[PDB]
């Protein structure tokens, strides 16, 4: 699918993703903190439709992501990200998507998630995160 | 004067300052690189006029600042920045302002200047820089 | 188990762990790079014995670890780290221990594993890694 790279910012304020309960994660778009002021990133859309959107508004300064978990698996010959979940210091934004395949989890003990990059076609093919202090 | 803080970015692409040959540095405004795309910062103007503008366009990826030098001194009871000069890996953007008072220089051996903060009234009262890898 | 924390150094030269094909990883020690000079970390021993030793000598500057994989599982009630495999740019130091339970994997796209921390009772209970540029 089409690769994307948001880059590095000051923090995260809101995450907006999409999913399908029988396939995988679809759309992905995050609004970052750029030195105090929000900065909305490019909307990375899927090649198709029929996804259920999710808007994750964090209490910016005080609430930040502590762990990112999910599942990768093959759906129709394409190994993609099927589920994604964000746990913060205040709440857990429950498993979105199908919780099947092989697991992964990135807990941060000291550091902050500061940016996103990855790829999206019909579903989210892959993704990586930028970390900082 | 009025304090300002641009914050941290990915790099610098252009610096736009102003000076008076008999007083000190006046206006200050920089356009940064925010993950590949330029980002123009807020224009920090002086309380007064009659300054000679300077536009410093760097060859972004390839040309970056290696040292920042200048002079601080008192001009009319106000200790301000009287001169400022930026030397890059390709050129020296010669002393702008009055080269009188006490000197300072910040050479970077490994690192990049990534943001600016300081204060401006009639002249640039002070300033600090954000460094990164 | 007993908590340890080696800290952060400049790089990694060698890793000496211990395992058992039916239980999990036991002993754990690592000799780091400290500004171009080897630095032998403390030996974090298991409370019991009967493990098989493995020495992982990297070609220090040239060879560096790019991804750490493993398994977290339940043995004797305790959830511990059952397997561990290190993938460097030159070779893969094959899985040690039991590849059974919940998988975890950290691929590093930009950065270095620069230190370790964790806990060891009879087996490695958990660990964490310091990441640097």
């Amino acid at each position: 699918g089409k690769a994307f790279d948001d880059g590095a910012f000051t923090g995260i304020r809101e995450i907006n993703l999409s999913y399908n309960k029988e396939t995988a994660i679809g759309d992905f778009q995050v609004v970052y903190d750029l030195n105090g002021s929000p900065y909305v990133g490019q909307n990375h859309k899927s090649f198709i439709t029929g996804f259920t959107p999710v808007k994750i508004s964090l209490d910016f300064p005080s609430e930040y992501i502590m762990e990112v978990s999910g599942y990768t698996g093959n759906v129709s010959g394409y190994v993609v990200v099927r589920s994604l979940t964000f746990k913060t210091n205040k709440k857990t934004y429950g498993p979105y998507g199908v919780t099947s395949g092989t697991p992964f989890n990135l807990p941060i003990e000291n550091g902050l998630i500061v940016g996103f990059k990855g790829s999206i076609g019909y579903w989210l093919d892959y993704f990586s995160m930028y970390l900082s202090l | 004067g009025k304090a300002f803080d641009d914050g941290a970015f990915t790099g610098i692409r252009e610096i736009n300052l102003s000076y008076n040959k008999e007083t000190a540095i006046g206006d200050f405004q920089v356009v940064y690189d925010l993950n590949g795309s330029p980002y123009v910062g807020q224009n920090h103007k002086s309380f007064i006029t009659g300054f000679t503008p300077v536009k410093i366009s760097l060859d972004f990826p390839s040309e970056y600042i290696m040292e920042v030098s200048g002079y601080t001194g008192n001009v009319s009871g106000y200790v301000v920045v009287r001169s400022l000069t930026f030397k890059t890996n390709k050129k020296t953007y010669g002393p702008y302002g009055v080269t009188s008072g006490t000197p300072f220089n910040l050479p970077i051996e490994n690192g990049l200047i990534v943001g600016f903060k300081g204060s401006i009234g009639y002249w640039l009262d002070y300033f600090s820089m954000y460094l990164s890898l | 188990g007993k908590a340890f924390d080696d800290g952060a150094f400049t790089g990694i030269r060698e890793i000496n762990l211990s395992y058992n094909k039916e239980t999990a990883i036991g002993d754990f020690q690592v000799v780091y790079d400290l500004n171009g000079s080897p630095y032998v970390g403390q030996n974090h021993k298991s409370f019991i014995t009967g493990f098989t030793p493995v020495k992982i000598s990297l070609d220090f500057p040239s060879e560096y670890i790019m991804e750490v994989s493993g398994y977290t599982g339940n043995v004797s009630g305790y959830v511990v780290v059952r397997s561990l495999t290190f993938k460097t740019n030159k070779k893969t130091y094959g899985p040690y221990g039991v590849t059974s339970g919940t998988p975890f994997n950290l691929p590093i796209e930009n950065g270095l594993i620069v230190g370790f921390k964790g806990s060891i009772g009879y087996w490695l209970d958990y660990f964490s890694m310091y990441l640097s540029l």
Binding site: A8, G70, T72, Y78, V79, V80, V81, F104, L106, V114, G115, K117, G118, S119, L124, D125, Y126, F127, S128, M129, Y130, L131, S132 | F9, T10, G11, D33, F60, P61, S62, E63, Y64, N89, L112, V114, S132, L133 | L106, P107, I108, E109, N110, G111, L131, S132, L133
Partner: peptide
């Protein structure tokens, strides 16, 4: 050089 760098982790999904 010229561009800032940060630790980027992963690439979870398609190899």
């Amino acid at each position: 050089s010229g561009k800032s760098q940060t630790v980027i982790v992963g690439s979870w999904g398609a190899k």
